[PDB]
Amino acid sequence: TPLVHVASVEKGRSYEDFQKVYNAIALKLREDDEYDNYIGYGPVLVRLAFHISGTWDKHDNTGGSYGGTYRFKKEFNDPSNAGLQNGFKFLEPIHKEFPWISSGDLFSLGGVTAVQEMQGPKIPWRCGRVDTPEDTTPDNGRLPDADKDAGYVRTFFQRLNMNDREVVALMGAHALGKTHLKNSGYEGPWGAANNVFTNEFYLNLLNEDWKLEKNDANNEQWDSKSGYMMLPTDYSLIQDPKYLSIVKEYANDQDKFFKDFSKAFEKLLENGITFPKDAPSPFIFKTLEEQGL
Numbered sequence: 016t017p018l019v020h021v022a023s024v025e026k027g028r029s030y031e032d033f034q035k036v037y038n039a040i041a042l043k044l045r046e047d048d049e050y051d052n053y054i055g056y057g058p059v060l061v062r063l064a065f066h067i068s069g070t071w072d073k074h075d076n077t078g079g080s081y082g083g084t085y086r087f088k089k090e091f092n093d094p095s096n097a098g099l100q101n102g103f104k105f106l107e108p109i110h111k112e113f114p115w116i117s118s119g120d121l122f123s124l125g126g127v128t129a130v131q132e133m134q135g136p137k138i139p140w141r142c143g144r145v146d147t148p149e150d151t152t153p154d155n156g157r158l159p160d161a162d163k164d165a166g167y168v169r170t171f172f173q174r175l176n177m178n179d180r181e182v183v184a185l186m187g188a189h190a191l192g193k194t195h196l197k198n199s200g201y202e203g204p205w206g207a208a209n210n211v212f213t214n215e216f217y218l219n220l221l222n223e224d225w226k227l228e229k230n231d232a233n234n235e236q237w238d239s240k241s242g243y244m245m246l247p248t249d250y251s252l253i254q255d256p257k258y259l260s261i262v263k264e265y266a267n268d269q270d271k272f273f274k275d276f277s278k279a280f281e282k283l284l285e286n287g288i289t290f291p292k293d294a295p296s297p298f299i300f301k302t303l304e305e306q307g308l
């Protein structure tokens with residue numbers, strides 16, 4: 016009925032092979048630090064990992080990270096994906112260097128690398144994604160809109176099998192990077208340390224004095240006097256009672272948040288994939304720092 020996407024390890028590669036891809040990405044993150052006014056490419060990679068995974072549909076098993084379909088024009092030119100071409104271009108040279116890795120594996124590894132190199136938690140990762148044909152490319156319109164409420168969010172996430180806790184954990188990724196008017200019709204960062212992974216998102220949500228205003232693209236956003244912004248969907252996390260109690264917990268305990276994020280992120284990246292019993296267990300990569308590089 017539903018497609019079956021069985022993970023198949025890149026022939027003859029082991030842990031050491033993947034750690035090398037990881038190190039290459041990480042070294043290039045360290046090196047191209049001027050991107051986006053010195054934010055670096057971390058945030059854009061994280062966003063890319065979400066976008067390639069978020070097209071999944073638990074009803075017929077289409078979309079998700081397995082097929083590396085973002086590589087095709089249709090998905091590539093998805094209006095919801097505007098701005099991601101920057102993460103793509105960042106990874107190309109890496110792919111050229113390690114041509115045996117599948118796309119889905121590369122896109123998803125980039126997210127993991129980014130998180131860990133920005134001092135986030137360790138995210139166990141699995142290889143085995145296999146490139147699929149251009150016709151397995153999902154139609155545009157499966158990614159979420161920003162101008163909605165908590166109801167919308169819950170519903171949307173349900174399509175990916177995520178519960179409340181998972182939604183809130185994943186959203187703390189909004190501590191990174193910022194919105195760009197030309198990309199999404201929104202402008203401004205969510206906080207101050209936008210290239211270090213922390214629970215800042217939750218603190219800003221609870222602690223700032225947010226004002227609803229229209230931006231230059233004529234969209235509504237929540238603006239704070241500190242110069243931060245929140246999308247309607249971010250703001251909805253404090254409008255929903257179930258969401259709000261989790262926001263508070265995270266605001267209160269970065270460690271808890273890191274644990275929840277880690278699990279949720281890996282789940283997101285593995286949705287739609289079947290891992291045979293002989294498949295290697297998830298790898299945990301060392302950072303540059305841990306290797307002394």
Ligand code: HEM
Nearest residue numbers: 058059061062065159160161185188192193194195198199
């Ligand atoms: C309701 C769900 C979500 C909505 C509506 C949403 C919407 C957006 C929008 C409109 C942008 C700005 C794009 C631009 O102008 O460059 C953005 C950026 C971003 N998104 Fe989300 N997002 C959602 C969930 C997530 C999740 C689950 C993650 C990862 C766990 C994520 C990671 C990011 C990151 C890191 C950025 C900043 C990228 C940069 O600085 O280039 N988002 N998101």
